[PDB]
Amino acid sequence: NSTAELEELLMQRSLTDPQLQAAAAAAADFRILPDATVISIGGQSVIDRGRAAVYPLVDEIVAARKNHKLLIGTGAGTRARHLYSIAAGLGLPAGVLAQLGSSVADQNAAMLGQLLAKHGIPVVGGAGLSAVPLSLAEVNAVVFSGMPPYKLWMRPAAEGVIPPYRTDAGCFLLAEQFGCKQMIFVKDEDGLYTANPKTSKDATFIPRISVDEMKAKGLHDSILEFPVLDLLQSAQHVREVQVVNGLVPGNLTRALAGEHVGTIITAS
Amino acid sequence: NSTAELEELLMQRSLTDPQLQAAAAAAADFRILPDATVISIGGQSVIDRGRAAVYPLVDEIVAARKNHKLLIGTGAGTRARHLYSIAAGLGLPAGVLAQLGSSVADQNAAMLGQLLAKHGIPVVGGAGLSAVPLSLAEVNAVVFSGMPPYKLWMRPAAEGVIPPYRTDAGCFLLAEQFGCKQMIFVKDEDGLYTANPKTSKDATFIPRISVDEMKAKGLHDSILEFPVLDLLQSAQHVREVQVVNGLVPGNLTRALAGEHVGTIITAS
Amino acid sequence: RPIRLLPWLQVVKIGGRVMDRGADAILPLVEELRKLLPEHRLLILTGAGVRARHVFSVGLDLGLPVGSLAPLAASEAGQNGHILAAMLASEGVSYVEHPTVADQLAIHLSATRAVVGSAFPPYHHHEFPGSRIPPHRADTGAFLLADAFGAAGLTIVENVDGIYTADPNGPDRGQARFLPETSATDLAKSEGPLPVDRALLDVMATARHIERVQVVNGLVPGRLTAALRGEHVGTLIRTGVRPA
Amino acid sequence: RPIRLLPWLQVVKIGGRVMDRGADAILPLVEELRKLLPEHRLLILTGAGVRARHVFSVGLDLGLPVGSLAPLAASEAGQNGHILAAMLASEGVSYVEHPTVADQLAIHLSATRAVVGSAFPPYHHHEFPGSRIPPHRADTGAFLLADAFGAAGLTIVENVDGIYTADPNGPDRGQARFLPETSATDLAKSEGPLPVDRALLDVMATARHIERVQVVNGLVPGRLTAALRGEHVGTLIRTGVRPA
Amino acid sequence: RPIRLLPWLQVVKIGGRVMDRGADAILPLVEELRKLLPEHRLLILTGAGVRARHVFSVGLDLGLPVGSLAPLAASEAGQNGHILAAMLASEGVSYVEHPTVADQLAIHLSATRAVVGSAFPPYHHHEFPGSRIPPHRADTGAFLLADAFGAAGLTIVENVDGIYTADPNGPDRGQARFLPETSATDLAKSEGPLPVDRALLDVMATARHIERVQVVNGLVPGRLTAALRGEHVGTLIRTGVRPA
Amino acid sequence: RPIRLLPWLQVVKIGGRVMDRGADAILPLVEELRKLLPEHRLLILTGAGVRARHVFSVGLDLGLPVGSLAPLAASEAGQNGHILAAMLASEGVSYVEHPTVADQLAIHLSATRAVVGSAFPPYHHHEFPGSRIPPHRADTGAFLLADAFGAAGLTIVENVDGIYTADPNGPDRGQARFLPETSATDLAKSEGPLPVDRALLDVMATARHIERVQVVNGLVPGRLTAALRGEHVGTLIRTGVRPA
Ligand SMILES: Nc1ncnc2c1ncn2[C@@H]1O[C@H](COP(=O)(O)OP(=O)(O)OP(=O)(O)O)[C@@H](O)[C@H]1O
Ligand SMILES: Nc1ncnc2c1ncn2[C@@H]1O[C@H](COP(=O)(O)OP(=O)(O)OP(=O)(O)O)[C@@H](O)[C@H]1O
Ligand SMILES: Nc1ncnc2c1ncn2[C@@H]1O[C@H](COP(=O)(O)OP(=O)(O)OP(=O)(O)O)[C@@H](O)[C@H]1O
Ligand SMILES: Nc1ncnc2c1ncn2[C@@H]1O[C@H](COP(=O)(O)OP(=O)(O)OP(=O)(O)O)[C@@H](O)[C@H]1O
Ligand SMILES: Nc1ncnc2c1ncn2[C@@H]1O[C@H](COP(=O)(O)OP(=O)(O)OP(=O)(O)O)[C@@H](O)[C@H]1O
Ligand SMILES: Nc1ncnc2c1ncn2[C@@H]1O[C@H](COP(=O)(O)OP(=O)(O)OP(=O)(O)O)[C@@H](O)[C@H]1O
Ligand SMILES: [Cl-]
Ligand SMILES: [Cl-]
Ligand SMILES: [Cl-]
Ligand SMILES: [Cl-]
Ligand SMILES: [Mg+2]
Numbered sequence A, B: 001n002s003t004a005e006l007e008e009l010l011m012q013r014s015l016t017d018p019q020l021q022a023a024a025a026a027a028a029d030f031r032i033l034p035d036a037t038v039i040s041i042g043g044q045s046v047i048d049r050g051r052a053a054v055y056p057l058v059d060e061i062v063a064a065r066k067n068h069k070l071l072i073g074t075g076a077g078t079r080a081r082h083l084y085s086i087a088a089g090l091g092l093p094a095g096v097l098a099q100l101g102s103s104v105a106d107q108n109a110a111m112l113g114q115l116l117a118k119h120g121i122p123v124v125g126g127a128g129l130s131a132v133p134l135s136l137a138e139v140n141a142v143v144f145s146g147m148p149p150y151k152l153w154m155r156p157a158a159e160g161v162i163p164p165y166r167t168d169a170g171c172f173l174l175a176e177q178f179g180c181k182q183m184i185f186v187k188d189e190d191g192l193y194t195a196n197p198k199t200s201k202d203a204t205f206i207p208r209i210s211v212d213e214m215k216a217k218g219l220h221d222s223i224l225e226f227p228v229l230d231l232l233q234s235a236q237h238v239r240e241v242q243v244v245n246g247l248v249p250g251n252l253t254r255a256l257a258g259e260h261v262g263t264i265i266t267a268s
Numbered sequence C, D, E, F: 001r002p003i004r005l006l007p008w009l010q011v012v013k014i015g016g017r018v019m020d021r022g023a024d025a026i027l028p029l030v031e032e033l034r035k036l037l038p039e040h041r042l043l044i045l046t047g048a049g050v051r052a053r054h055v056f057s058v059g060l061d062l063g064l065p066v067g068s069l070a071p072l073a074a075s076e077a078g079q080n081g082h083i084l085a086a087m088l089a090s091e092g093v094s095y096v097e098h099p100t101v102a103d104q105l106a107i108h109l110s111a112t113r114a115v116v117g118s119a120f121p122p123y124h125h126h127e128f129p130g131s132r133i134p135p136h137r138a139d140t141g142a143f144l145l146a147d148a149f150g151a152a153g154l155t156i157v158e159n160v161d162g163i164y165t166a167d168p169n170g171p172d173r174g175q176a177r178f179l180p181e182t183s184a185t186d187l188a189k190s191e192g193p194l195p196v197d198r199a200l201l202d203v204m205a206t207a208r209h210i211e212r213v214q215v216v217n218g219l220v221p222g223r224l225t226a227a228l229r230g231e232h233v234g235t236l237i238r239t240g241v242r243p244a
């Protein structure tokens, strides 16, 4: 209601107080990079496939940055699964596995960045992400590693030691924090199907679906990491995502032009 | 022959296997910064000489970056020789001397960078060289320290504790790794002579020579660090270098315009 | 379940509001900690306190999202940690940062008897959305660390005796009843303020090692010493992990 | 010759392919290392293994030069080092990075009995040209470190008994004869695969202190212990440095 | 007055020009330091010497301001520190950088008996204007550190016996009289060269703990040992801090 | 009340009858103790067991007084202590005798993490008259030591779960009810056998520091570890000393 009322509660109450939480919710909402688009590139589904998959996407990135501002995050892939399997067999906790997976996503960001270096597009990192503002303004794109920085403080899943917040969640959380206008997941299928199209003959394509409808039909952990769907329902800025096939030439260019290729998943 | 055959050998054989080495040699060859030129500025021969040598070269760099993309590495000079002499008298190994020499090359890069800062040209470093892509794209030039990062893991020479891979080798290896189109050494002589022109009356100028011809006439360790000539013969991208006099006004500008001032040394 | 990385470690979390009282509270606490160094191997983690409320007030007025506010509050927990370590420097105690805690804590606890760090986790601009107040704060980060290490315990040092049925310094203070013992699931089903992060109860539900956490009054000398010996002098919180 | 910086140090290099076998090989090795901590001052360095082959496969398909592939493989040796250090954390052992090894190893070996690092050298984008496979790998980097420090020895822990006249797991395995002892110059004149980097033989020719390096089977418990006492249980490689 | 952070610490500053003499001076000094390790807890800080004069000569010819020249000279003090630490590495001594000295000195002095650092302060491009020569150099930085820690003493190791009434190696050397004892205020009122920074006298006027600093000849073995025991073997400088 | 001499010490008393079961009980106990060394500073004291009953049988048949029987039984507690220390020797643990415990325990606990001694007191031929069985045995001596030092606790490791209302291995075993908690004055007013010396209850009445003693089953791995953290896994005995 008032700034003086919010500041009095902030000084006199615990941060857990529902009265304080409700007053903070009425604060104004500033978007840091409202005109940027975050693009997640799959590790196992794209980058691990090599030249045939990566080279056409590099061409699309160079072409797209003429009219679009892009933040491009990389997945991890089969090298992370090997590390997870070694470490899990030793009894190491989820927080140790999270550090191991971050280094694989760093590898993939470095390989992509070297194919883009002659176009001026850099690889960025650090806890401050301090190279993002200047690079976006001058060359309209940056490359970053998709893994979140939780490391040993990673929240475990209810079962097992596989970290539940990986490169899909990391990319999404950056889009939500920066107040970006669009979030696009680039993988190796046309979109969401009623079942895994690799292991089922009769899967049916789904062009548009809500998170609740996905849970009601057993798709909570399908083409996206399951925590992404829950974060999507809590989000303030990014209330839908789009999943597209990166192996189809021009699919990323057309998604950025507002064509409805792939599947659109809405928070509500 | 095939990607599947290379990947089978990569999984089943030691990396020392000649069959694996031969299959890896047939891989495609990507150049990271094919349109850039690396320029090495001598420490003892140029920067240690002060204003009379450095100020005209600063003017040439500012003028050249209008039509050329430049990576400018600095040598070390007389302060490194003093450190090498102290440390050698104590019996310290080559790996310790290499760390001491790197700090002197850092000093010279910082001094040059401050004369260029108002033109937008930065000093770059770090194991990732992550500031190179954006700077080259926007201001067409960067400054870096020429010393390699080997430090304690520096390969010793066959005799003595002086590190054999210093700022000449460091600059060359960066040109070769980035797939640059040109490598220019800037020192204080017109080029290679049949003997040291400072200590011999009748030295004759050599405009063009191969590495094998240099060894056959006793010039293996002349105006360039001797390992540079061996690295040149192994190189994939940079198969010749040019040595020019930095004390002659406009010599760097004219070398960048394709004039054959100085000496051209070819791998074969 | 996963193995224990540092099974002999005791973790102690110091509340920001305790540090906010200045020398009157810090000096007796420092003297108690000094006497504990020969008895336990300690990781001491500090919370944020009132300065985080001020930066929340400025940042929320500027409209900043929750991913911006989280590292601003963690910086204040780091400053409390530098202050506490300076008072213990003559005993060999230094402050160490997030990257050192995650990778080199073992060698630091071999060089010296105790280490000081920040209790906030490094969630940075990847904090969860939903509330405009960062949810993963000092209680939550300290528990995440202690359970991942498989430490022998975590003790939370507060400016009140423990958890009450209502804020003992608030409007309904007259109806506040002290809770000697409770469970994380019982607290999570309640509504109203608590002295600990709500997200602490969530990470307790997925814990793998730590079975109980005690909240004690750091303004009464001797209670931290007793809690580290397992004596019941505050509120015990059962996490839900079952013993063998 | 130059002085010895750490004359009392024992260096141990663990092969990437040993770590690739998982708990079945790592747990007995960890138990043997634990028992060695009170007997020797150890610098433990890890190699890269099969994950470096996969990143070589992707990077070579993308056309990347050898200066790009070298730090990508070194990252996998770092991950093996984090895994091994986590298993030894309860003994006070942590992983440390390249800048710490080159400048602060002496104080770290005073705080604790052993330190874990990566065996790859930090050649980064300054790797030598010639082959499309980075030549200065884990065996080479470990020897460079051990000789520069003037350490008392370097022992290489492999997944085979030692060096044979041919690959004992390859096509010509039937003709493979075990070599109890050899010299670096004799190996350098041969053609065919080896269990150690070819560049290891080159840096052995310019060595200043280390006279012999033994390659032993880390899958047989007790052999690392015996090698650190100078018992002959694998292949001995003479470097060419002469004794006094 | 403020409390003492490390009341048991002895600080020793080694002049750059002492290190410039090479092995003939460094080897006896290293042997004396080695024998002091079991007797004192030492922070050893190195000055810059003649290489800083050369970089001043090049930088002043290029026109660079005093904020550019200051970190260039501090780099040379760092190199002297790496050299000295390498000679002491077998005793567990390593070099540590400015951020480590300011925040983690306490844990480093618990892991090992002595630590080596640079004597120059990190004033970087924020050096004071006025003279074209950086005023806050190695003597000044070492005193600032020692007084802020409340250390038990600071001893300055020089290439002359102490302070004279004129340069004992200069034009007026014939009139140079040795000063066994003096005060900082008396020196500040004089004109002419000194063996210590002029800014050292300024920070002595605002000191809170250290009452005296002795300047001794590091080229005479045994004098550093005697000075650390409070014996009068050089020039004593009274700072102006009063005892209880 | 008197000051605490070693306030950070944990005392652990191992029953003679536990040691009498041989390797089947000793090996798991030794492994648990080994894991406790990095967590606590331990004084481990052993009781006598069945061999003291045999020497009582021979000595009582010879007519010997209680002052003769007391050192004969204490010798058997010393032998159990030599056996336990030999199993821990590789961890730096040695056995020490009565004169060393009374005068030099402080320096021995600085050299190593744990020390083994005998639980019997040195009453020798000055044992009290009255019963023909020496009254001041292993439980009594361990408590006397722990209270005089002002130690942080004493834990008694038995071959049963705790104290019952009757002998759980005797004739009335069917009526034996387990006692989770009791007081020394309540036990002293009862008649019948106990698992602890009757004289232990007497010295508890005059204690100055120790408020509680827990009796736990040493044949169940993990219970000693839990008791040293103050978890309730056996019978708690309240001594009568009041807390602050
Ligand atoms: N209902 C579904 N519809 C579409 N795809 C599905 C479905 N269920 C499972 N999938 C599978 O999920 C895969 C994509 O996720 P996966 O984690 O394998 O790749 P990724 O996103 O590249 O992982 P990372 O980026 O972590 O390496 C697809 O290849 C697809 O086969
Ligand atoms: N045959 C030769 N022809 C030309 N110059 C020679 C020859 N032999 C020796 N030289 C000398 O080599 C010198 C250049 O190398 P030098 O290492 O002295 O300078 P630098 O490259 O600036 O070193 P740094 O960059 O490491 O400080 C020239 O000044 C020249 O006198
Ligand atoms: N149910 C409750 N029981 C006890 N205290 C409560 C309760 N609800 C609110 N409080 C208040 O919470 C206060 C503790 O504040 P808070 O937990 O924010 O400080 P802190 O833990 O020291 O800070 P930080 O989280 O930054 O370390 C108590 O003084 C009390 O007034
Ligand atoms: N002449 C040889 N003698 C013995 N083994 C050989 C020989 N030639 C090839 N090998 C093979 O080399 C394998 C060892 O692989 P490699 O040396 O690449 O692994 P590593 O040393 O564990 O890995 P890294 O170098 O990453 O640490 C052996 O299992 C064996 O099959
Ligand atoms: N009044 C004086 N008394 C004594 N020495 C003087 C005096 N004035 C000048 N000097 C000269 O100062 C010299 C010491 O040089 P300086 O103090 O610059 O070296 P340093 O302290 O070793 O160097 P750094 O400050 O880099 O550590 C002496 O050798 C002496 O010649
Ligand atoms: N009330 C009781 N509660 C529990 N145990 C009892 C009781 N009365 C007798 N006992 C018996 O006491 C036995 C323990 O024997 P005891 O206390 O003599 O051995 P110890 O303490 O190992 O020997 P030592 O005193 O020489 O160290 C138990 O096994 C149990 O059978
Ligand atoms: Cl909350
Ligand atoms: Cl090879
Ligand atoms: Cl001055
Ligand atoms: Cl009795
Ligand atoms: Mg709180």
Ligand SMILES: [Mg+2]
Residues within 6 Å of the ligand: D015, D139, D158, D195, D196, D197
């Ligand atoms: Mg090998």
Ligand SMILES: [Mg+2]
Residues within 6 Å of the ligand: E015, E139, E158, E195, E196, E197
């Ligand atoms: Mg001086």
Ligand SMILES: [Mg+2]
Residues within 6 Å of the ligand: F015, F139, F158, F195, F196, F197
């Ligand atoms: Mg008993």
